[model samples]
Target chain A: VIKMVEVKLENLTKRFGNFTAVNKLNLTIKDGEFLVLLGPSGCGKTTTLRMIAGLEEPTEGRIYFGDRDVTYLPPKDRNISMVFQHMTVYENIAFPLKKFPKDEIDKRVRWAAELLQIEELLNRYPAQLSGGQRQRVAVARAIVVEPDVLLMDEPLSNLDAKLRVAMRAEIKKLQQKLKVTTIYVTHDQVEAMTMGDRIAVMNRGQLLQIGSPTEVYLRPNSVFVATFIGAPEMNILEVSVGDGYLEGRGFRIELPQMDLLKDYVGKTVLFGIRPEHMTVEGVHMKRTARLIGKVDFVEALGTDTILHVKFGDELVKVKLPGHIPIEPGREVKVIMDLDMIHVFDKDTEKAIV
Target chain B: VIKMVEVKLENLTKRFGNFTAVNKLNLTIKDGEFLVLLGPSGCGKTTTLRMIAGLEEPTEGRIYFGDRDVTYLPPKDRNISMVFQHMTVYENIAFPLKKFPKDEIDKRVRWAAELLQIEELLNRYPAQLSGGQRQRVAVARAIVVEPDVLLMDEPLSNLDAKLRVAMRAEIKKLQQKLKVTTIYVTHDQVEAMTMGDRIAVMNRGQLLQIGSPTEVYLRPNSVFVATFIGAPEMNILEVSVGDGYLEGRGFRIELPQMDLLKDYVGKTVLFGIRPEHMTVEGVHMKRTARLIGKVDFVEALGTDTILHVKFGDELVKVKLPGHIPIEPGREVKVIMDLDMIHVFDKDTEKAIV
Candidate 1:
């Protein structure tokens, strides 16, 4: 029986010699929830997951599964299964169901294989399987054991572009069906957004913020989170705040629409907008949010187009539907969606007004 | 003098021992235009480019560059500059201009740097520069030599996702400005569509089709061409043609509103439709062409939503705009744009009449 655990990390600090891998990180992972730990390489996301899995010992603070403490427990004793980057298809699956009776192994393995649509691949080696199949096998192995918590560490990073996408959906569906608590670690924001019920964005052995995918994307607490959560990153401009408006090099934007930060003014701010939120000569334009810029470059990306526009020294990216017929050196007025505009304190690099 | 070469190949064949790498082929490269030699790995695209550059000798056929036969000419004698995969940035730029006066070398390198937008990285070593910068330097070196044709062999393949995009556009614009006839090779379908003036698709050493991006995507001459040129590929379904309509296992479709394909009847057919051409049951609904299937998978890609609908043995991909609130395992009726459907003869895999 797989009893889901609500994991909690209290002032968890993990260090490797001189390197502080994970600082005093505190988070409460809910039962039957998909939690993603996202950051770049060497960002302590892996360290955080390893600590919870009992593969790495935390130097400070306590970890709990519901009301029980499990900081010093061995990995096997923790009742959690993990699919790591270096794991092979057979080994990953075998590790979880090792204690089961050998007579039931064939049946259980076959059932898991069928569930993952890989029944035809049981005898085949991991190297023989396609990238997508291997990934499915990894997930099937983890879920077959029905562990209390499922942990993954960038398992799909090696797969091809198309296969990586296929596996993302499969994992999300499997976890939702099994209702197992999952902690996934990935550097890809798209993967984090697509799979996580709630995500903890980590950076340089420290916690940045923790929230749902929608929350992380729409209201990113810091500049790093804002830029990391979206593809092509968000275009940011340093603006001077005065008269209840933030004025940049080319455009003046009003923050009255954002009730959360309207009171803070006469301070330096960073104005953020997604490429899609900014348009050229649209009727839905706001008066204070108009930016005049020259089209520095244009890229035709199959289904959509990307424009690299220049306003003074500021280079901003704008994404348009299909292909936008525009040439370099052409002047255009960028209309910002004020309602969607995100603001942050320039010095603190944190969302303020 | 940089004269655009009209290169022609007749009975072109390549073989490594008993293995026929490239079978008997014939084609012509137009003057002063951008042509991309595109295909999967070991598809002989590189062999074709190397033959053009005189790096490899064709077992059969004659290679004519502007009426002058260059089949036996060496790479240097062919008067073509290539941005090879192992191109060294500093040496690539400096070595070409080495024979010039010391004063002229500085001017030439500076001019080349300015053209490639790499003036800031002139002193930086090749290993220190980013993938995009290195690629631009490679291009700069190629163009600096003032060759008759430029041959690029997956130059941008090494770059990160975003940088590859940005540098490719720079290359396209520079080629246009310089009016140089160029031949580029890439396995990426999106890259072929956006970068090349005309794209030649190849598979298993066979040239499938060659056309403009719009022409290739919209009116693919064969099934291979139709499926290869788009992401999520085209939804291909086997159908029976009779009584002026097509009937599949679970789909009923009418002939696209084109008189060219109206003559076919009682013929086995295959139908292809792009994901974007189908929409959720809403505004535009045509009575003639309709398909109903249960949603097997749904992926949230931020910009758009992708749905994998199951119909019998086939999983048809439907890309819907924005968040539609469609759940997996839910039945959804979508309108397939009849005007955008492609019909092909099942037996020959060729566009059907």
Candidate 2:
């Protein structure tokens, strides 16, 4: 059996009069890889997906499927399966599988349904199914075509928080089992981190970075990348470098061991650190970088606590264990892992290390 | 002048035809205390709050503001301020405080607005304000009258995640400063734990328990309360209790030092433990009561991780630090904290020890 063709977009750009929506976007889908396109609103992630699906024609750029140019082709000729939030399960999955011979159709339907563990739900309508079930139906229908590529756009957005987590696992399992070249799009960085083999992060119609989840997280390319990828966001403090220390309006913190940060000393740099890497002075605050800030607020996230500390107008959020008894409005010294310090050049907003 | 007044609901029950929405509920709110009513959908929490606000007439019982009975009084005359989801915020807090004399109104409005940190937003219309600002205005309007009691029905639900956390802190601070007796309602247990002086947990039209956050969390009154108060819910195992030990379906755990559990021996019980108390048995498996389960899924919660485990027909979720590397389908041994184990009578679903 021949697999569906791989889709590619080269120098893709979409414009509306003076506005450029997707600007010179180049993306490639490796065979049998699960990739996610993630960005904020107006970031052009959705526009790029539409262009590749043949739903929207790119203002500039050419599309190819295994060297076959299909930029001007109709959506029906694209030979790709698609899933989205609004599509009805029966119409999307069941209706599409009806194309094959009657005898083989049942086998195919049963096969897809069985693989998705929804064999008994064939007669159930979309409204009758739970959000998780309906989504399974959506995936089942998309894969029933046995297309070479599958495209999804914010597929889990409509589900409740708990169901969304469940659906992410299901989708990941299905993708692994099917081994189809898949491209999923969402704005949630957490979703991208957990589900994607690699993620494409975009901002202002520009792709900021593309890498594995850990790669993007541990070494964010820019200040925007570091801020957008984590919940509670990263604590960003603008500091003037002195000797081997970083100093801002409220406090001073020593720079940790990093060869890349050597050239950034004496210059103004933004210090970025994740809450997980931060520690209260008394408990494992062994890092050399220390900043004194008043606790603004604390969020008990069951297992850990988030401390929102304010030093002047700048606020830094630190994640600590829930067992710690830190109170708000109290002044506390925060230490950071020097090795984990992300130094960003304030002028370019890009990370130096 | 007295800063605050106490509030109480005595044998309060609201019945609509055949449905008993709130069944014989009794609770006390001390002066300047923050009390939260928490439960899932159809648990009569909203009905209980409405009864307190005089919006819904209770079938029986009385509500007290300090020592004074205000059960039959109209909402306007009762001097209780409420911030419902639909409550509108005006350009100035004085718009609501206008109920008072002109000179007195201005002073009270400015004071209330300042207390909620909306002093700078006094001139801005509700449409021009951020969701948190609008909520602050709504709260300012409520307290502008300097009511004896404050009732908030999920007031922070409309804000986004970050803003919700910020508003929770702001509301808690404002309530503490104003010395207003607060009766807040929400389904989110984390919100209940973070803001409440005492939490009233309800289920199936009944007031299950009312206690401090730590008391309820560490010593839940029932299986339902134990399960509902934490994320991923509480993991429950059916066990045989005998000779100061509890033997479960998969593992055996010794009871923590407790004199009350002496009579609990030789009884069939449901052992409950929160996910936060369950540790990944990394080098500690042999010294503790540990069970091997297959991982169903892992959810990335930014600062923390949740490993959902499946054993036979049951599922147990464990909370872990985000840095750990774990995946679905992997076998894991999780150790339980015996001191934190909650023992509940299986038949009655009540905490026995």
Candidate 3:
């Protein structure tokens, strides 16, 4: 089986006259790996995907599929296929299979359908299927060609939330089983984290960060990356470092002993800590309030609760597990995890940790 | 200062010819409380909301606003205002204020806009405002009427995920400050849990459950309610009870000692447990493993990770806090919280304990 083909892009650039669509970008999709291009609209993630797919010719740079320069080749000449929203189950899966012999055409369709657990759905039309089922048909069609690289652009954006969650797992499992090089483009962070082997975060036509989900989430290289990857977003406050401490709006927090932060002492910087990394101090908070705030608002998410605490005219969201019967206006101590706290240069917005 | 006008629905039903859209439903939305009508599409939630709004006349029964019967009232007669997706910020907030004197219209608009922190955007049109800002304008318009009840039908559905999180708190805070009764409708469980003082779950045109978010989530009344209220849904498996042991396919779990479950000892029952309630047995399952399964898939959600474990061809999703570096195909001891286990009657599909 032909399995090891790494898709590489070198200084890939795209432009629409005065506008830089996909800025000079560099990326590599490892053999049998899933890479997600993640960003919001106009962030150039979609443009980058289009360039890689041979649908949009790049303004500069080269593309190679394991030593073969496929930059000038059309989609048909390149070993690639893309799945979209959908068509009829049978016809959709068999569209690319028509290039094969009739004897093996049915074989490819049956194999792809089985992989997606849609064997019984072959006789049905896309209109006759549920949204999740139609997506399976779309995916079945993409892989039916047995292409070296499979590309998907917001494939589940049309489905309901619950169905999207279900399909995330299904597509991830299918990617593993197929072990094909895949490039998935999406603006949803959840989709990028759960489905991609590695996520490439981009914004304003620039690659901001590229790493495994955990690395991108936990050790984001900049303030933009830090906030974009997490829900509730990371709480950012202006702070000035001091003697083994950080002074934020109306509160003070102890900083971990690290040489990296020593140079920033007495200078203002951006302080960031995720909601999950802080908590309301338990066992009553009378003795010595470290960082106190009044609960301005509460959001109960079933599995977790987010308390919007107000201190000195500023609000910080604290995430707590399970349902806490805390109401707005309740005074509580906001405790930050010493090790989990983050710092960013105010001038450049880059992480200092 | 009319603060206690409870919304009451008695034997409420709506029928579209042969199809019973909303079955015989009875509900009471407490005065000044935010009540969420939650269900999937065609589940009668929107129909119920419409009936209460005087938008759709009920097929049978009555709707009471305190001591007044408003079942036959027109939209203009009811003391209610509905905040929709949107219109121009200035014109929209001033729409209902026109009913007041010209001198007081600007005053009411200014006061309402200030409450939603949209005073700066009052001069701008909806086209000039961000989705979150436009929603504020819609909400300002709703409250400017000083209505007895505020009806919101997925007002933030047009906003993106991050903005939705922010707006949920804003709406909840606004409701608390105004002390206005609210009836919000949405199919999203997260929205319902986060914003509602009490959530009414509907299915097949019937009110299946109504309680605080915590009560409905922790003590769901039926299998449908159990699965519908939580993300990842609830993991359900058919188990036959015997010898203090519950036998499911490919595994056995010990049941808690309780008289409520003894009656179903020998009968086959549906066992339900939420993904967050269970965990991967720590200290690594060695020796006599309690419940064993292989991790078929892993979904990293940044703040939490969900492991899809496979047993006897059935997959049970287990949620763990924070990042987990586990891979698929690894054997795991699936640990169940005995006290949290739910037993449902097989024939009735209702919770037994």
Q: Please compute and give the TM-score of the first chain of candidate 2 against the native first chain.
A: 0.91
Clashes by residue pair, model 2: A4-A148
Candidate 3, B1-353: lDDT as tens digits: 22646999999989999999999999999999999999999999888888989999999999999889999999778888876565567678878763478778888888888999988887777667863476677778788878897888878878888778888888888887788899999988989998898999999999999999998998998899999987878899998887777788877775545537677778899988888777876722122225788888888878878888885757888888777858888999877766667888988889985
* All-Cα superposition RMSD per candidate: 3.9, 3.8, 3.5
Worst 10 residues of 3 chain A by lDDT: A281-290
Please tell me which model should have the higher lDDT, number 2 or number 3: 3
Greater TM-score among 2 and 3 belongs to 3
Model 1, retained fraction of real contacts? 0.27
| Residue A335 Cα positional deviation in candidate 2, in Å, after optimal superposition | 2.6
lDDT of residue B8 for candidate 2:
84
**TM-score for chain A as predicted in candidate 3:** 0.94
Which candidate number has the best TM-score? 3
Q: What TM-scores do the predictions have?
A: 0.88, 0.89, 0.93
lDDT of 3 by residue, A33-127 (tens): 99999999999988877777899999998998888999999988888887655556777788876357877878888999899999888877766
The B-chain TM-score of model 1 reads: 0.90
- Model 1 lDDT per residue over B32-127, tens place: 788888788888899999888998999888888887898999888888888866334545687886347877766777777788988877767777
- Could you give the candidate ranking by lDDT, starting with the highest? 3, 2, 1
